[PDB]
Amino acid sequence: RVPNYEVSEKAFLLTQSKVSIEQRKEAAEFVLAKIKEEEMAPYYKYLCEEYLVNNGQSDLEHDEKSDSLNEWIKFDQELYNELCKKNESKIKELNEKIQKLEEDDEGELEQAQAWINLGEYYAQIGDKDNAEKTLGKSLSKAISTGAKIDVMLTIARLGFFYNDQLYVKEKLEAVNSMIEKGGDWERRNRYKTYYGIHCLAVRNFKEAAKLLVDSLATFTSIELTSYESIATYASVTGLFTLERTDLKSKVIDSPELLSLISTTAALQSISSLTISLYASDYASYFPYLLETYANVLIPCKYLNRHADFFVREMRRKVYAQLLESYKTLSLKSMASAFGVSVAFLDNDLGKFIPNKQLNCVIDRVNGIVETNRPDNKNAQYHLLVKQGDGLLTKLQKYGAAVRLT
Amino acid sequence: MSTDVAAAQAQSKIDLTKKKNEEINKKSLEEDDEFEDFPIDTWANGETIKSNAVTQTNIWEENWDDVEVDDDFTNELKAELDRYKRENQ
Amino acid sequence: EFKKLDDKPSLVDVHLLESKVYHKLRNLAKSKASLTAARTAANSIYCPTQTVAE
Amino acid sequence: GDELTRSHFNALYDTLLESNLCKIIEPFECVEISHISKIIGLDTQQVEGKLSQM
């Protein structure tokens, strides 16, 4: 339970090689120690899958690639023997116990428990298939609703554990159905933190934001990553969705976030960036935009997919707020504002304005930035007609279709 | 394999015994199914559908990227080089 | 853990201190809850002058 | 010597300013920020910066 979310993180750094060298080597050391203790060796085979002549490979059971920057990810044959030894012993000892527990009477308690213990072992060592199958029996047997929700989060943890988003998705719909059926407040909090990280892994950050602020108020340290990691995710999403007014009220109506103060490198960078946006002084914003990429998005398992997306979106957002309150700007005063140069700025702007998603124009003769964002009724009309074009379209097709058959 | 929103035409039309011949005729008129001709025709299989994360298999949502070039390396070079000019100002 | 070794007026001191700590972590939710508890725990009459000043 | 005065003199500057500035600008449109900076008793740049937040 506990050590699995630790290892998967640290392994994700070795799968990449864009991460700092000291970070990657220390990460290698933590995961190797836990192969001995918790038998994370079958999980070590999964890391080679993700490569094949792609970097972060130096494997001895597989193909060793010395054109790579990782060299501490040795898949020794000392490890591989240790696996076969530990694997056999544990299956033999556990089997013998469980057979005799099933034979003694009581299906409601005993036989359900005995099979759950089978799924705990296969869950622990990173065999998904055999955990699945044995824990399917546990659910079928007459057990409380709380036990089922528990086992479902345990199966879904293995999907996080392999860092495959696909496996997780299905399992969290199963809890989403069964959480209303249990009516158990205890594990309701557990659902929120799992499901927050799933919205985070997909591009739904409006939903993630609501969940990850709630994770501050109640966190659960069983099978779930650190309180500092949950704090970092809340900050990331808060900046994404919310602009000044909404964002300021979120982190001022969030006292729990504040007690935790920044106690790790990932957390600094996002927490400092928050201050600069809603205070309306983006002087520090542009250097911090780099730092947050470096220390949040690249190391995390759930934001590396969005690493490039985040910086694209945020570059619009910060500029928009300045352009909103200013009917005119000078390129030079606006260049000073971020801490950028004049020419660099035009480039970033030259991407945002054709999709017409930022609404500004730039006189390069006068040097000024005009803002053609409508702040009147013209804006409301621009919303309305594209919905009504679609309304027309939706009825044309559904109506025509039923007449024909 | 469905054209626009997959569910929008899957509910819109479904099979009938009556329609089934006419449908087959439509695909034959163009002359092929035009998704199994194309690998032979080029004499390769996909690697240029591996251009972006979203292109390969849609298991995300759209970003509106189309080259997926990290923008951190360019923003870092601007940041440092600008400071130095101001330092030498 | 000192509800099994409890007769003492010495937990009044601890609640008030606790609220002060929470204030400077900048979490006022449980700073307020624990202050009330300190006030109610001081509503019984035995308390020094310093204690009320705090 | 006091953390607490440093906190609430931040607050004190925002409210004293906000009352002052509203009155100066009440009957004005297209008023120069150069004109405002004299009367209010603050720097030209600071005026611009306050207005943006508001």
From Swiss-Prot, chain A:
An example molecular function term from Gene Ontology annotations: structural molecule activity
Any one cellular-component term (Gene Ontology): proteasome regulatory particle
Describe the protein's quaternary organization and the partners it interacts with.
The 26S proteasome is composed of a core protease, known as the 20S proteasome, capped at one or both ends by the 19S regulatory complex (RC). The RC is composed of at least 18 different subunits in two subcomplexes, the base and the lid, which form the portions proximal and distal to the 20S proteolytic core, respectively. Component of the lid subcomplex of the 19S RC.
Q: What does this protein do?
A: Component of the 19S cap proteasome complex which acts as a regulatory subunit of the 26S proteasome, involved in the ATP-dependent degradation of ubiquitinated proteins.
Query: What's the main place this protein lives?
Result: nucleus
Provide one Gene Ontology biological process annotation.
proteasome-mediated ubiquitin-dependent protein catabolic process
Q: Where are the TPR repeats?
A: 112-145
**Sequence intervals crossing the membrane:** none
Localisation: Nucleus
Please share what else the UniProt entry notes about this protein: Present with 51900 molecules/cell in log phase SD medium.
Residues that bear Phosphoserine: S58
Q: Which residues form the PCI domain?
A: 204-376
Q: What is this protein called?
A: 26S proteasome regulatory subunit RPN7
Keywords, alphabetical: Nucleus, Phosphoprotein, Proteasome, TPR repeat
Q: Which domain of life is it from?
A: Eukaryota
From Swiss-Prot, chain B:
Q: Which residues carry this modification: N-acetylserine?
A: S2
Q: Which UniProt keywords apply?
A: Acetylation, Phosphoprotein, Proteasome, Transcription
Q: Where are the Phosphoserine modifications?
A: S12
| GO annotation (BP), single | regulation of cell cycle
Q: What is noted besides the main data? A: Present with 5590 molecules/cell in log phase SD medium.
UniProt function note: Versatile protein that might stabilize multiple protein complexes involved in diverse pathways. Subunit of the 26S proteasome which plays a role in ubiquitin-dependent proteolysis. Also associates with the TREX-2 complex that is required for transcription-coupled mRNA export, and the COP9 signalosome, which is involved in deneddylation.
Q: What is this protein called?
A: 26S proteasome complex subunit SEM1
Q: Which gene encodes it?
A: SEM1
Curated annotation (Swiss-Prot), chain D:
| Species in which this protein is naturally found | Saccharomyces cerevisiae (strain ATCC 204508 / S288c) (Baker's yeast)
The family classification in the record reads:
Belongs to the proteasome subunit S9 family.
Q: How is it modified after translation?
A: N-acetylated by NAT1.
Instruction: Indicate what this protein is called per its UniProt record.
Output: 26S proteasome regulatory subunit RPN6
Top-level taxon in the UniProt lineage: Eukaryota
Name the lineage: Eukaryota, Fungi, Dikarya, Ascomycota, Saccharomycotina
Q: Which residues form a coiled coil?
A: none
State the function annotated in the UniProt record. Answer: Component of the lid subcomplex of the 26S proteasome, a multiprotein complex involved in the ATP-dependent degradation of ubiquitinated proteins. In the complex, RPN6 is required for proteasome assembly.
Q: State the remark under miscellaneous.
A: Present with 16800 molecules/cell in log phase SD medium.
Complex formation: Component of the lid subcomplex of the 19S proteasome regulatory particle complex (also named PA700 complex). The 26S proteasome consists of a 20S proteasome core and two 19S regulatory subunits.
| Documented effect of changing L51P | In rpn6-2; temperature-sensitive mutant that shows defects in proteasome assembly when incubated at 37 degrees Celsius
